[PDB]
Amino acid sequence: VNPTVFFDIAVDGEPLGRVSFELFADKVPKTAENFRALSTGEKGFGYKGSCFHRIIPGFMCQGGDFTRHNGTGGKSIYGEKFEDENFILKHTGPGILSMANAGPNTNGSQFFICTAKTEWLDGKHVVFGKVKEGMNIVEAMERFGSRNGKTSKKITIADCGQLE
């Protein structure tokens, strides 16, 4: 069964709400597994406490740098950036979860949650999940972004994990 993970979002430390994701392990198991493991913290590092460093309303919310906490870091569970597993799934609309990268085969930990259809990213970024519940939290988050991407309040993953 495709795994479910959650983020508990906070805004300058004030809880906003829980966002739940389906991870498409049936299509991109290696990419799903990375994100699942980073969400549970089981390897002794991961997303908890990290922030969404770049939010552009009408485009996406980007996060996942738990190593430098400045948008320049992140790391996979595989000891090295990992391969683009496939581009079977497309950026079809709001709620898609996709990997940020530095060009082909450079997947780490950074990701984005789309707030619109982003079809120009098809074939460049690996789509691996989708918001299941709490898209309205992502819409609320999105309001703290700006056209240039800097956030006006600190948007954090206060807790995260895998759901039964």
Binding site: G71, S98, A100, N101, A102, T106, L121
Partner: peptide, 13 residues
């Protein structure tokens, strides 16, 4: 060995 910063680009206009 130095690797690149993960990013995602806005649509080209």
């Amino acid at each position: 060995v130095v690797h690149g910063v993960a990013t995602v680009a806005e649509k080209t206009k």
